[PDB]
From Swiss-Prot, chain B:
Protein name: Proteasome subunit alpha type-6
Keywords attached to this entry: Acetylation, Cytoplasm, Glycoprotein, Nucleus, Phosphoprotein, Proteasome
PANTHER family named among the record's database cross-references: PROTEASOME SUBUNIT ALPHA/BETA
Function: Component of the 20S core proteasome complex involved in the proteolytic degradation of most intracellular proteins. This complex plays numerous essential roles within the cell by associating with different regulatory particles. Associated with two 19S regulatory particles, forms the 26S proteasome and thus participates in the ATP-dependent degradation of ubiquitinated proteins.
Residues carrying N6-acetyllysine: 101, 103
Disulfide bond annotation, renumbered to this chain: none
Glycosylation sites (chain numbering): 4
Subunit and interaction comment: The 26S proteasome consists of a 20S proteasome core and two 19S regulatory subunits. The 20S proteasome core is a barrel-shaped complex made of 28 subunits that are arranged in four stacked rings. The two outer rings are each formed by seven alpha subunits, and the two inner rings are formed by seven beta subunits. The proteolytic activity is exerted by three beta-subunits PSMB5, PSMB6 and PSMB7. Interacts with ALKBH4.
GO cellular component, one term: P-body
From Swiss-Prot, chain E:
Catalytic activity: Cleavage of peptide bonds with very broad specificity
Active site positions, chain numbering: 1
Subunit structure: The 26S proteasome consists of a 20S proteasome core and two 19S regulatory subunits. The 20S proteasome core is a barrel-shaped complex made of 28 subunits that are arranged in four stacked rings. The two outer rings are each formed by seven alpha subunits, and the two inner rings are formed by seven beta subunits. The proteolytic activity is exerted by three beta-subunits PSMB5, PSMB6 and PSMB7.
Residues of the full protein shown: 35 to 237 of 239
Name of the protein described by the UniProt record: Proteasome subunit beta type-6
Source organism of this protein record: Homo sapiens (Human)
Swiss-Prot record, chain F:
Stored Pfam families: Proteasome
Modified residues (N-acetylserine): 1
Residue numbers bearing the N6-acetyllysine modification: 76
Protein name: Proteasome subunit beta type-3
Family matches, as InterPro entries: Ntn_hydrolases_N, Proteasome_beta_3, Proteasome_bsu_CS, Proteasome_sua/b, Proteasome_suB-type
Family designation: Belongs to the peptidase T1B family.
Cysteine disulfide links: none
PANTHER family the record matches: METALLOPROTEASE TLDD (PTHR32194), PROTEASOME SUBUNIT BETA TYPE-3 (PTHR32194:SF10)
Residues passing through the membrane, by range: none
Top-level taxon of origin: Eukaryota
Protein role: Non-catalytic component of the 20S core proteasome complex involved in the proteolytic degradation of most intracellular proteins. This complex plays numerous essential roles within the cell by associating with different regulatory particles. Associated with two 19S regulatory particles, forms the 26S proteasome and thus participates in the ATP-dependent degradation of ubiquitinated proteins.
Swiss-Prot record, chain I:
UniProt-annotated location(s): Cytoplasm; Nucleus
Protein purpose: Component of the 20S core proteasome complex involved in the proteolytic degradation of most intracellular proteins. This complex plays numerous essential roles within the cell by associating with different regulatory particles. Associated with two 19S regulatory particles, forms the 26S proteasome and thus participates in the ATP-dependent degradation of ubiquitinated proteins.
Protein species of origin: Homo sapiens
Modified residues (Phosphoserine): 238
Induction per the UniProt record: Down-regulated by antioxidants BO-653 and probucol. Up-regulated by bacterial lipopolysaccharides (LPS) and TNF.
Protein name: Proteasome subunit alpha type-3
């Protein structure tokens, strides 16, 4: 199972994801990126069935970049979330469903920061923090315990590291490194990869 | 104006600058191109068809040369105009009657079958890829509520019910003669209606018919099936009007 | 569901219960199960209830087309053909078990139209879950060419037996009497069971329910 | 008085004629001459081969349809190839469904059924190619002639193309000898018929002669540049 | 269901029971399982009621249109070929065993079986339905060559009464129909009109 | 059950010239709560709401396609929709998917846009309308809600008693459902105002 | 069949499209419609050609059509083609709202309609939609906007424009009286009735003969309303007073 | 099979000449009068019935669409039957979606959209009929006219057919807002008599009314009673 | 003219001239006759073999379109083979759907309606051939119809299509054909074909004969070569 997490502060969204691609016994890639830049202030974090993740998310990415090319301005992260939800919900009952779990992170200039949970059925939920994978079961209670809405991003990285230390302590799969990015008014920033 | 034209309006079914459709009027001329005339008159308990029957060739099988057509057991028609167009509307009328009985459980009325064939015939006058059928169809039958019904549809798509009707070359003469024999009375019986028909045709034609020169189809309330009279029976009516 | 109909001397008496169950739980206590088709023809519905709703509304639309086009009074055999040909067209996957009845120029006609598309032209039919209670009352007490009030009493007695003997049936009896001259749609005809009266007064007052946030949004 | 009657194939002239069909027959009256002819044992196609220039090769005339049928085209070469692919596909379908060679008359009837369709539908055009179809089956050899008028002809011998009237004159003159000829005599009669279509200065060489033979134990074989020299000599002078 | 049709000289006799069951509940106890396809052609219906009604309606449609085109009374072989075509084309879709029996001016009284699967065979007598199994032995030991209309009516009524006695899916009343050149005579046997057969009680 | 995947609970209740519609607020994957602010009541007019329980992706989809067809109706039509006509619109939208059906069971609470007559109804997943005069319920705590509403509903309640009744009904019903709760939002629809209150509910 | 073909989608030997120019001529003979941008609103102003008869005035406007929550339009040309185009605009706006859950920006809606008009001027062999449109709207991207389409499928952003009868004299007046950036809503109403008064050579300008609609933002909501004829009479009498102050 | 190109195209002056020629067909048609009263709408028309062999009770010009909508036309009758059929089907499609009787203006929009479609689509001529569409809902009567172009107007009173412009001046001269429905039937018969030429009977005109009780054609006994002292 | 370019166009007289031009293509063809008699129907075609280079049996104008029906054509012979294959398809599908041999009336009605289907539209042209269908069975007896390019299907005792149809019909009318067996009708048919043949124009033709009737048990076959030689011998000695 593959792990995503987002944390939405006052003026930023902190997202992390496990950096592992596996084939059922072996970690075939230990520097694998699950984050997809939709536009300059939108990340789509995708886990799910193999193949569906990259195909669906590169579909969403080319249509959001095509919106920016057609229009001279970007989609808002709300509009990107509803577009992603709409394509996933339309493909739900088609012949070719996408079994993908999604965190859409985003910073809007007017709306502020925004995080969106999305399960594989395409239920969209705006959330102050959210996570996928089986590690979400271990980490969301720590996030319920320690998150306040006025969290600084330094305390957000410390809380993220508490979640990842819980995954090292208690979770059964080896998830050694975590790609950590942050979105704010200055765009998407690669933070340091939390390693163990 | 006064019958002017501008464009392709004499060649396809589009409007002239007066709002006429010249191809439909030309289909009305194509009815008269056949050179025969049919006359149908409705009684009180009957409805009858008389029509010309020209076999000038004598190698024609006279039983096959007909314009009487059984559409269903109760509804019959005479055709007037171009023969293959007429036979196409006969096949389409038989289809619509059979399909009505299948979809609806009861036999098609004569006004509804004539409305159906007229609504088919309208589409020929609006789409430019086909011409109107140059044929006049006169349906007869017994309605369950209204008794005898004669109905005529045209190349234009106009249908009406008729007390008596005619189609063909002498349609105007037959319309004048039947306005004569309808204003005073309906001249009614099964005997008077089949004789008003044969008198109308042999009056506007002035031929003083033989029984081998016409053919007659009847519907009555007592016998609701569309029945064709034979040469003996038409000969009986010709004896009855030859003695005056 | 208990729906039934007889043919009496002058027409049709249809009957239905008013219970709609979702599972073994009463959803509606006042379901309407006798549906308008044409001014002379109604239809009782059992089976999948949305299927009976959409099916009888579609056939009501088709007969309003048919009667505006012919200018006549629609027949029960036409509704019968339309229903059975569509339900056969959809292979029984539309569960519209129907009691069709009406009076035309040819007299009263009653039909039981099963979801696969088979039809039975009978003087008295029952459909639904409590159909065998109602058919017990019908096979017990039917006579040909009964009067109107004898037929109404018979149909409501059969629907009442379905109410008091089937767990999926209950709460009221609707009748729809059709004759050559008249249309009586009786809703409710008989009310067999009432709610037992309340003993304790509760009267939840202002300040009982604690409220976190409150919004007033005025209009015009 | 003809300008509106000669641009569509769905227009009859007032003389009861379709001018696009006659124009597509002019298209085969201006192809190079080819000669079909048969004996009791064989059926040989003999075709001139024009060249667009001296440096260009000769456009091939004789095609393969099946192991028992060969054709020689005249007219438009793309319609010729399209029609020949129809013929090849029908022979393959016959050998797949029935495991037997398609009879030559039934294939020619299928060609007539195919080519009649565009001569009656709007915007379509007649296949502007005439075939000489040599086939062999249970009913002996067969020479067939197809037209862009969709008519098909069952021939003792036939020549089509440009200047083929002289060849038809020769074949009418000497067709009473063909059924008792052997293979080599029959091919020499076909070569003389083909040589009648030439001008007075032109003579048949190994360049401009293509010979296709189907026979009793002989599959359809095309004889080209070096292979025609056992047949071309011979030979009588003109 | 028990359906039956017997050929005599000059026409046929058709006969069916009247019970339609929904499992072991008798949904209709007076079912008319003889259907007039044309004026002198009936069909006997056994099997799925929806399937047999739809196929009989569609063959009634096609055969009526065919007879109006040809200006002839239809053949009984034509009606049976239409049932065969529709019951063979949809043989995975239908549960329909049909006996087509009628009269025609060209060939006389004819009985054809179109059983499930959709084959077609002309027979002197034909039985079908769930109850016909109980009377195969009776109709084999009883059928005679050269029977009259009245003997075929009584033979059909007896064999139907036997099958209705042993089958639970068969019962009700006996609907008979004799079809000849003169027309169609239909009759219902009920109560004591149905042939009784005495139960072998212990002496 | 696919209906009980996300949980959910909506009821609508009719008063004296006023209706009340109420939803729980839990969004949940299954046993995992995800958010506590999930919208299940959707405004379809000034005095006309729909409440959707069931599968949350189909909740969002039916609300959006209904608002699609509704905005086309109110532009082409030039008027606000009547609640009966909204019900037939929802029944059509759900019955179009008869064999591929939207896993949602909507309740519709509203006032008539002309005479302000109270309307409540509910529908099943394939669009069978059910117009009651007292209450409709929908969701995974349906039996709880029918028990509380048969126990507490009175005819002709002013909006204070109406609010208290649908409030106690929703609270005591969702405290017996595991997949429902996490807050209860209540709308009170009057001729002059809409009152939206959220309730102090148990968060477990 | 090729004899009867009309060839609506071919070029002229001068490279012109005849049917597009003839539909443009038809709009040049249509009813007058103008729109003016301001800092706090956009307006429309439409002459009624179905003006003064036993008409009923059922709808909220003859020639103003609301497209979504944020946009209105106004047509000039074939009224049936105009109905087809306004229905399609409403469908495009609601499909955007279905797909993105936010209202459509104005230039996207205008572009999406002009793609359909270009499609009927390029392929398909049908006649072009003979309707020009004026689009008004607010959005969160570019604010108050004013557009103008034509049967070719061309469009453009305008600060003041006019379609219909006398649009050349109207756009000359809108050159010689408009102030870029200094226009409020009331001054634009004054300019609208000034241009409508000086581009109707028939009849005394009467308030039963114009429809004026405004689009403003109140409280974060777009308010689209066609101005009632009491207000329109008051504005025409204000124009009468401002012309009586020319002495 | 069909043609795929418009037969109605633009002329260099901007005219659509096939629509104008369909209008020439309408103007040569039988006179129809519509008057929207205070509590109803009357639709009166002239049965151009020469040749008394015609069954005058067989084909109706005034023709219902719903319980509350009725049409009448001027122009080409078979095109009117096509528009009757399409209007009845469109009205019942509204009833199948919304389970509500269709509003009159919405039906006029849909049928005008049909008449638009046969002015642009491939290989058709426009309909040679203008319609008069009456209707009652929301306690308010509606009177609409659908042109052959597919544009639709809302009238308080109007006329179409032969001598339609003088009939519209007559309806300008006679109509007022507080006029009741029986006064509307009186003034509609007067407007048809203004261009009738040939002694009105109960069988050569046809009147249908629409009110709160719905739409109905008048029986010829009722029409004879409205022709009294007239 | 302007009115003769389409089969979807009437004249101001009400004429579809493409149909009349297809019938003028019929009256450019050589004469095919057919005589229905007491026990069957005998066809006969003046088959003009235009070149000596064709086989004797090339361009057959007598067609077996079912095993009880034959077909004699006259006109544009590619359209004739097209209609023959339509008639074969129609008889085949009749047997496949209804289960018996198609009545000649119903075969001629269906193929005539196929012919009429190309006289309505501009997307097609009318067929340029008339054809005679002839059958025999025990019930139906001898039957002979004929279908022109307009699609008119009439019954005939003796019929004639082609360029000399008037001379052929005035020699068929001289026969009491209703009381004759087919073995005398073949000599009558051969006599009529050699009478109506123009011999200064378009020489060197072949007589192509066939019958259906009692003497083939309803099967439509060509006349055997001994009977066809003695029929041509009778016709040569009777032509003088």
């Amino acid at each position: 199972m593959e792990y995503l997490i987002g944390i939405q502060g006052p003026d930023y969204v902190l997202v992390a994801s496990d950096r592992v691609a596996a084939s059922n016994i072996v970690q075939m890639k230990d520097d694998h990126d699950k984050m997809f830049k939709m536009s300059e202030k939108i990340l789509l974090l995708c886990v799910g069935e193999a193949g569906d993740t990259v195909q669906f998310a590169e579909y969403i990415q080319k249509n959001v970049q095509l919106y920016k090319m057609r229009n001279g301005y970007e989609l808002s992260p709300t509009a990107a979330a509803n577009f992603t939800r709409r394509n996933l919900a339309d493909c739900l009952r088609s012949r070719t469903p996408y079994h993908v779990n999604l965190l859409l992170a985003g910073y809007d200039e007017h709306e502020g920061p925004a995080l969106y949970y999305m399960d594989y059925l395409a239920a969209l939920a705006k959330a102050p923090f959210a996570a996928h994978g089986y590690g979400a079961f271990l980490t969301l209670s720590i996030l319920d315990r320690y998150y306040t809405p006025t969290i600084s991003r330094e305390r957000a990285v410390e809380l993220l590291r508490k979640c990842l230390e819980e995954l090292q302590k208690r979770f059964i799969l080896n998830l050694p490194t975590f790609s950590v990015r942050i979105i704010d008014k200055n765009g998407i920033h690669d933070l340091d990869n939390i390693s163990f | 104006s006064r019958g002017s034209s501008a464009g392709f309006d004499r060649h396809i079914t589009i409007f002239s600058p007066e709002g006429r459709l010249y191809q439909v009027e030309y289909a009305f001329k194509a009815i008269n191109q056949g050179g025969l005339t049919s006359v149908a008159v409705r009684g009180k308990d009957c409805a009858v068809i008389v029509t010309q029957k020209k076999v000038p060739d004598k190698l024609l099988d006279s039983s096959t040369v007909t314009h009487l057509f059984k559409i269903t057991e109760n509804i019959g028609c005479v055709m007037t105009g171009m023969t293959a167009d007429s036979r196409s509307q006969v096949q389409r009328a038989r289809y619509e009657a059979a399909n009505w009985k299948y979809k609806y459980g009861y036999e098609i009325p004569v006004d509804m079958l004539c409305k159906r064939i007229a609504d088919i015939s309208q589409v020929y006058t609006q789409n430019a890829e086909m011409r109107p059928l140059g044929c006049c169809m006169i349906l007869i039958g017994i309605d369950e509520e209204q008794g005898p019904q004669v109905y005529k549809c045209d190349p234009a798509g106009y249908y009406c019910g008729f007390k008596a009707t005619a189609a063909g070359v002498k349609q105007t003469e037959s319309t004048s003669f039947l306005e004569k024999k309808v204003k005073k009375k309906f001249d009614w019986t099964f005997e008077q209606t089949v004789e008003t028909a044969i008198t109308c045709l042999s009056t506007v034609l002035s031929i003083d018919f033989k029984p081998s020169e016409i053919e007659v189809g009847v519907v009555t309330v007592e016998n609701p099936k569309f029945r064709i009279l034979t040469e003996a029976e038409i000969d009986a009516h010709l004896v009855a009007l030859a003695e005056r | 569901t208990t729906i039934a109909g007889v043919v009496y001397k002058d027409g049709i008496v249809l009957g239905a219960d008013t219970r709609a169950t979702e599972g073994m739980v009463v959803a509606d206590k006042n379901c309407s199960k006798i549906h308008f088709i044409s001014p002379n023809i109604y239809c009782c519905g059992a089976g999948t209830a949305a299927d009976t709703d959409m099916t009888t509304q579609l056939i009501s639309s088709n007969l309003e087309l048919h009667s505006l086009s012919t200018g006549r009074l629609p027949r029960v055999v036409t509704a019968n053909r339309m229903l059975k040909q569509m339900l056969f067209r959809y292979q029984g996957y539309i569960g519209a078990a129907l009691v069709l009845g009406g009076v035309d120029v040819t007299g009263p006609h009653l039909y039981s139209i099963y979801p696969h598309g088979s039809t039975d032209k009978l003087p008295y039919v029952t459909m639904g879950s409590g159909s065998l209670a109602a058919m017990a009352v019908f096979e017990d007490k039917f006579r040909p060419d009964m009067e109107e009030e004898e037929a109404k009493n018979l149909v409501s007695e059969a629907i009442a037996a379905g109410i008091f003997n089937d767990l999926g049936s209950g709460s009221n009896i609707d009748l729809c009497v059709i004759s050559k001259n008249k249309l009586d749609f009786l809703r409710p005809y008989t009310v067999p069971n009432k709610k037992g009266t309340r003993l304790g007064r509760y009267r939840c007052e202002k300040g009982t329910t604690a409220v976190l946030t409150e919004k007033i949004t005025p209009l015009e | 008085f003809r300008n509106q009657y000669d641009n569509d194939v769905t227009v009859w002239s007032p003389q009861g004629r379709i001018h696009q069909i006659e124009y597509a027959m002019e298209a085969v009256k201006q192809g190079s001459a080819t000669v079909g002819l048969k004996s009791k044992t064989h059926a040989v196609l003999v075709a001139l081969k024009r060249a667009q220039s001296e440096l260009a090769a000769h456009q091939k005339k004789i095609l393969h349809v099946d192991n028992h049928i060969g054709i020689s085209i005249a007219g438009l070469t793309a319609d010729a190839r399209l029609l020949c692919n129809f013929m090849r596909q029908e022979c393959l379908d016959s050998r797949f469904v029935f495991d037997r060679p398609l009879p030559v008359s039934r294939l020619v009837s299928l060609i007539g059924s195919k080519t009649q369709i565009p001569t009656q539908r709007y915007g379509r055009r007649p296949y502007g190619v005439g075939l000489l179809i040599a086939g062999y089956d249970d009913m002996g050899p067969h020479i067939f002639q197809t037209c862009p008028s969709a008519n098909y002809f069952d021939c003792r011998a036939m020549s089509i193309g440009a200047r083929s009237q002289s060849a038809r004159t020769y074949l009418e003159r000497h067709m009473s000898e063909f059924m008792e000829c052997n293979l080599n005599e029959l091919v020499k009669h076909g070569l003389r018929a083909l040589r009648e279509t030439l001008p007075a200065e032109q003579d048949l060489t190994t360049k401009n002669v293509s010979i296709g033979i189907v026979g009793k134990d002989l599959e359809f074989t095309i004889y080209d540049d070096d292979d025609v020299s056992p047949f071309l000599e011979g030979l009588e002078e003109r | 269901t028990t359906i039956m049709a017997v050929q005599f000289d000059g026409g046929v006799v058709l006969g069916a029971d009247s019970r339609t069951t929904t499992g072991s509940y008798i949904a209709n106890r007076v079912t008319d399982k003889l259907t007039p396809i044309h004026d002198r052609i009936f069909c006997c219906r056994s099997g799925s009621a929806a399937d047999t009604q739809a196929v009989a309606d569609a063959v009634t449609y096609q055969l009526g249109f065919h007879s109006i085109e040809l200006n002839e009374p239809p053949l009984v072989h034509t009606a049976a070929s239409l049932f065969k075509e529709m019951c063979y084309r949809y043989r995975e879709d239908l549960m329909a065993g049909i006996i087509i029996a009628g009269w025609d001016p060209q060939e006389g009284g004819q009985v054809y079986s179109v059983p499930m699967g959709g084959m077609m065979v002309r027979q002197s007598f034909a039985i079908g339905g769930s109850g016909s199994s109980y009377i195969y032995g009776y109709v084999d030991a009883t059928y005679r060559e050269g029977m009259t209309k009245e003997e075929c009516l009584q033979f059909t009524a007896n064999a139907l009464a036997l099958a209705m006695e042993r089958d639970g899916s068969s019962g009700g009343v006996i609907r008979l129909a004799a079809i000849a050149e003169s027309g169609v005579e239909r009759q219902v046997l009920l109560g004591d009109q149905i042939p009784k057969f005495a139960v072998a009680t212990l002496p | 059950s696919i209906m009980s995947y996300n949980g959910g609970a909506v009821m609508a209740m009719k008063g004296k010239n006023c209706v009340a519609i109420a939803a729980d607020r839990r969004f949940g994957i299954q046993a995992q709560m995800v958010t506590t602010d999930f919208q299940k009541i959707f405004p379809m007019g000034d005095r006309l709401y729909i409440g959707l329980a069931g599968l949350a992706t189909d909740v969002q989809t039916v609300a959006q396609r209904l608002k699609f067809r509704l905005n086309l109706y109110e532009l082409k039509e030039g008027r606000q929709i009547k609640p009966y006509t909204l019900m037939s619109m929802v029944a059509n939208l759900l019955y179009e998917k008869r064999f591929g059906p939207y896993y949602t069971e909507p309740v519709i609470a509203g006032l008539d846009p002309k005479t302000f007559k109270p309307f409540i109804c509910s529908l099943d997943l394939i669009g069978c309308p059910m117009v009651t005069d007292d209450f409709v319920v929908s969701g995974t705590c349906a039996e709880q809600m029918y028990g509380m509403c048969e126990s507490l509903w009175e005819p002709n309640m002013d909006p204070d008693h109406l609010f208290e009744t649908i409030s106690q009904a929703m609270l005591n019903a969702v405290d017996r459902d595991a997949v429902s709760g996490m807050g209860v939002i209540v709308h009170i629809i009057e001729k002059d105002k809409i009152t939206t209150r959220t309730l102090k509910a148990r968060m477990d | 069949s090729r004899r009867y073909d009309s060839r609506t989608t071919i070029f002229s030997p001068e490279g012109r499209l005849y049917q597009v120019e003839y539909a443009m001529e038809a709009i040049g003979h249509a009813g007058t419609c103008l729109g003016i941008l301001a800092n706090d609103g956009v307006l429309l102003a439409a002459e009624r050609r179905n003006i003064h008869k036993l008409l009923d005035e059922v709808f909220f406007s003859e020639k103003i059509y609301k497209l979504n929550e944020d946009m209105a339009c106004s047509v000039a040309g074939i009224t049936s083609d105009a109905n087809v185009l306004t229905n399609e605009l409403r469908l495009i706006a609601q499909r955007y709202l279905l797909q993105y859950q936010e209202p459509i920006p104005c230039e996207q809606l205008v572009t999406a309609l002009c793609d359909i008009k270009q499609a009927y001027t390029q392929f398909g062999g049908k006649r072009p939609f003979g309707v020009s449109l004026l689009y008004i709207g607010w959005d969160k991207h570019y604010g108050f906007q004013l557009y103008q389409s034509d049967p070719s499928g061309n469009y453009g952003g305008w600060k003041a424009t006019c379609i219909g009868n006398n649009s050349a004299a109207a756009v000359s007046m809108l050159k010689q009286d408009y102030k870029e950036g200094e226009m409020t809503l009331k001054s634009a109403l004054a300019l609208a009735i000034k241009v409508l008064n000086k581009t109707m050579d028939v009849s005394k300008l009467s308030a039963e003969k114009v429809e004026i609609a405004t689009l403003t933002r109140e409280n974060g909501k777009t308010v689209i309303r066609v101005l009632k004829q009491k207000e329109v009479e008051q504005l025409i009498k204000k124009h009468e007073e401002e012309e009586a102050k020319a002495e | 099979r069909g043609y795929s190109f418009s037969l109605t195209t633009f002329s260099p002056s901007g005219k659509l000449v096939q629509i104008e020629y369909a209008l020439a067909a309408v103007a040569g048609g039988a006179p129809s009068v519509g008057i929207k009263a205070a509590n109803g709408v009357v639709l009166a028309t002239e049965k151009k019935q020469k040749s008394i062999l015609y069954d005058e009770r067989s084909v109706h010009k005034v023709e219902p669409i719903t319980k509350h909508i009725g049409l009448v036309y001027s122009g080409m009758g078979p095109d009117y039957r096509v528009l009757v059929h399409r209007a009845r089907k469109l009205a019942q499609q509204y009833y199948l979606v919304y389970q509500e009787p269709i509003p009159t203006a919405q039906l006029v929009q849909r049928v005008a959209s049909v008449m638009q479609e046969y002015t642009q689509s491939g290989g058709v001529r426009p309909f040679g009929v203008s319609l008069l569409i009456c209707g009652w809902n929301e306690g308010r009567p509606y009177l609409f006219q659908s042109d052959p172009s597919g544009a639709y107007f809302a009238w308080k009173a109007t006329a179409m057919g032969k001598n339609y412009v003088n009939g519209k001046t007559f309806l300008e001269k006679r109509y007022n807002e507080d006029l009741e429905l029986e006064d509307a039937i009186h003034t509609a018969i007067l407007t048809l008599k203004e261009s009738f030429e040939g002694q009105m009977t109960e069988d050569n005109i046809e009147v249908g009314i629409c009110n709160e009780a719905g739409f109905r054609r008048l029986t010829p006994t009722e029409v004879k009673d409205y022709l009294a002292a007239i | 003219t302007g009115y003769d370019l389409s089969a979807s166009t009437f004249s101001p007289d009400g004429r579809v001239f493409q149909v009349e031009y297809a019938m003028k293509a019929v009256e450019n063809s050589s004469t095919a006759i057919g005589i229905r008699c007491k026990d069957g129907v005998v066809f006969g075609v003046e088959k003009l073999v235009l070149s000596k280079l064709y086989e004797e049996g090339s361009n057959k104008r007598l067609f077996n379109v079912d095993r009880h029906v034959g077909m004699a054509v006259a006109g544009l012979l590619a359209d004739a083979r097209s209609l023959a294959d339509i008639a074969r398809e129609e008889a085949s599908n009749f047997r496949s759907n209804f289960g018996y041999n198609i009545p000649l009336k119903h075969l001629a009605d269906r193929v005539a309606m196929y012919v009429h289907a190309y006289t309505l539209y501009s997307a097609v042209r009318p067929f340029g051939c008339s054809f005679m269908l002839g059958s025999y069975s025990v019930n139906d007896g001898a039957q002979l119809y004929m279908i022109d390019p307009s699609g008119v299907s009439y019954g005939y005792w003796g019929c004639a299509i082609g360029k000399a149809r008037q001379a052929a019909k005035t020699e068929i009318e001289k026969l009491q054909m209703k009381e004759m067996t087919c073995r005398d009708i073949v000599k009558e048919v051969a006599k009529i074909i050699y009478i109506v043949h123009d011999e200064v124009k378009d020489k060197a033709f072949e007589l192509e004969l066939s019958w259906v009737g009692e003497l083939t048990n309803g099967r439509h076959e060509i006349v055997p070569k001994d009977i066809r030689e003695e029929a041509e011998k009778y016709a040569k000695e009777s032509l003088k």
